[PDB]
Design a protein around this ligand. Structure first.
Ligand code: FMN
Length: 148
């Protein structure tokens, strides 16, 4: 079967829950899903062997757009991950009280495109408690699968 990698940076658990929800959706559809906390990964060759890569990251920063801390090293070395020609999609939790709502997702997408990835679906941005967005999360995973 096709193999999917999900890597998530999450501090309060929201993007982690989102990743777990996406993983079950893909696994139910027949994907072999490898889900990893970004804190545990190294960037070099990270995407090797994977037909689909899903990257999740929350947004931070006192008065700038900053990526979740565990994701920053992966972003900083994203050019070594094997993203060229890779089918990728991005997701993240945020808070719409911030103007740059899920700004980290946008930043990861833009760099992926420079690096030659194929963005298979527009990034998923979740407001507030992601358990109150379960339908949106499952639907997005479904749409990602249908777009590859
Ligand atoms: C200092 C600070 C800055 C934040 N900045 C943003 C932001 O710019 N855009 C956004 O969408 N959310 C912002 N947030 C909201 C967090 O991303 C939100 O709490 C999210 O649910 C955390 O997801 P996680 O538990 O997966 O880490 C900010 C939160 C804090 C504390």
């Amino acid at each position: 079967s096709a193999k999917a990698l999900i890597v998530y940076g999450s501090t309060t658990g929201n993007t982690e829950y989102t990743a777990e929800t996406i993983a079950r959706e893909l696994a139910d559809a027949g994907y072999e899903v490898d889900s990893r906390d970004a804190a545990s990964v190294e960037a070099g060759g990270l995407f090797e062997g994977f037909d689909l890569v899903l990257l999740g990251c929350s947004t931070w920063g006192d008065d700038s757009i900053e990526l979740q801390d565990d994701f920053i090293p992966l972003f900083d070395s994203l050019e070594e991950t094997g993203a060229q020609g890779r089918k990728v999609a991005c997701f993240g939790c945020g808070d719409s009280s911030w103007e740059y709502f899920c700004g980290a997702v946008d930043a990861i997408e833009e760099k992926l495109k420079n690096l030659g990835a194929e963005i298979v679906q527009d990034g998923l941005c979740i407001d507030g408690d992601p358990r109150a967005a379960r339908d949106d999360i499952v639907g997005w995973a479904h749409d990602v699968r249908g777009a590859i």
